[PDB]
Amino acid sequence: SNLEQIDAELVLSIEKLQEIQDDLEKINEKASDEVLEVEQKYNVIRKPVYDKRNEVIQSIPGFWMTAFLSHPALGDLLTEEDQKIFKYLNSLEVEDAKDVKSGYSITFHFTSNPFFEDAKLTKTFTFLEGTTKITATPIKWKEGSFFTWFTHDEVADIIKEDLWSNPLTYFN
Amino acid sequence: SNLEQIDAELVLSIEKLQEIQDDLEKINEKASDEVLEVEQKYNVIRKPVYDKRNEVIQSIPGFWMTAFLSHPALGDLLTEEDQKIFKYLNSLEVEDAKDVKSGYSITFHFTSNPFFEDAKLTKTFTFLEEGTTKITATPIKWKSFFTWFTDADEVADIIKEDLWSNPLTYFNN
Ligand SMILES: [Ca+2]
Ligand SMILES: [Ca+2]
Numbered sequence: 289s290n291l292e293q294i295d296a297e298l299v300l301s302i303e304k305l306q307e308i309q310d311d312l313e314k315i316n317e318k319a320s321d322e323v324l325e326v327e328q329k330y331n332v333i334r335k336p337v338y339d340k341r342n343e344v345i346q347s348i349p350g351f352w353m354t355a356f357l358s359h360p361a362l363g364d365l366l367t368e369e370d371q372k373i374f375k376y377l378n379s380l381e382v383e384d385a386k387d388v389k390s391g392y393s394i395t396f397h398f399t400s401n402p403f404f405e406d407a408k409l410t411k412t413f414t415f416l417e418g419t420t421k422i423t424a425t426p427i428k429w430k431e432g433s434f435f436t437w438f439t440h441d442e443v444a445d446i447i448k449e450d451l452w453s454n455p456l457t458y459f460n
Numbered sequence: 461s462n463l464e465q466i467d468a469e470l471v472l473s474i475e476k477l478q479e480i481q482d483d484l485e486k487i488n489e490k491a492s493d494e495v496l497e498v499e500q501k502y503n504v505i506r507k508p509v510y511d512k513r514n515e516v517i518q519s520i521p522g523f524w525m526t527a528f529l530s531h532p533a534l535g536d537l538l539t540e541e542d543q544k545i546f547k548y549l550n551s552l553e554v555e556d557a558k559d560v561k562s563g564y565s566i567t568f569h570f571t572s573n574p575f576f577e578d579a580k581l582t583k584t585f586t587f588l589e590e591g592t593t594k595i596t597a598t599p600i601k602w603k604s605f606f607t608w609f610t611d612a613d614e615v616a617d618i619i620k621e622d623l624w625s626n627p628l629t630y631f632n633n
């Protein structure tokens with residue numbers, strides 16, 4: 289009687305619920321794709337602004353080193369010899385992957401210097417299951433430390449979200 | 461005599477940097493607005509699907525209780541007495557403000573129980589237009605997890621983004 293109908297309804301309702309979650313999964317995937325496309329679009333928009341900013345910074349001889357040193361979290365990470373190398377740092381760069389979700393890289397651009405041969409040291413973060421893999425430029429030291437960073441990465445997030453976003457508020 | 465002593469080109473480079481940062485600020489705000497618009501669009505689209513999910517759930521006894529009690533993180537947060545209480549949970553409900561940005565609330569609907577008076581225990585997260593946000597909650601009217609209802613959030617994130625989003629995966633296990 290009523291018990292059989294409730295029983296049958298219960299079996300049916302579990303299946304319909306699996307259908308509803310499948311619908312919700314596809315809706316959540318469309319929405320997070322759409323949020324991602326907005327961020328991809330605005331990385332396009334910001335790119336020439338970051339370029340102009342890099343151009344202006346060429347006129348301020350120790351800008352990036354100075355902003356990095358004035359940042360409360362980052363500044364105390366430069367041992368005194370690190371700061372002599374940082375004298376040759378002339379540009380920092382952060383770029384998301386084209387699709388955003390799959391990572392980004394951080395690059396320290398170095399002028400010609402006696403410590404190492406590289407013009408740039410890059411640390412890359414790839415991740416697309418929650419996990420992430422890191423790669424870094426193996427430093428081509430010359431014959432004659434914060435630089436251990438080039439091998440849960442809080443220095444990366446500070447650089448990416450604070451210093452890279454507005455280094456001027458630490459420079460000022 | 462601060463900027464007067466400084467080389468003109470250094471002075472003007474800072475001014476131009478400040479102006480570029482202002483441009484970047486405006487760009488970031490157009491990006492926020494555009495993302496907010498996407499969240500609002502899909503809040504509307506999901507609403508009748510959540511309603512249909514709530515309707516179907518009425519035919520499954522103890523659904524929300526079983527999903528909460530089977531969640532690996534959330535389950536690890538009940539006392540044995542907290543589990544005596546949750547046997548009386550009939551419904552979970554997460555609702556964002558009509559604009560997404562204002563915040564959201566999480567509501568636990570309990571049936572008549574011997575532990576407290578309330579039928580709804582609600583924890584509302586209000587995002588203020590100026591910085592810090594205001595967190596309100598229900599004062600339990602008793603006749604631990606329920607320490608979560610303090611106006612002072614890992615639990616709220618797990619509920620909003622995990623349990624509420626797909627409870628059926630924890631009903632099965
Ligand atoms: Ca369908
Ligand atoms: Ca679209």
Ligand SMILES: [Ca+2]
Pocket residue numbers: 465466467
């Ligand atoms: Ca002077």
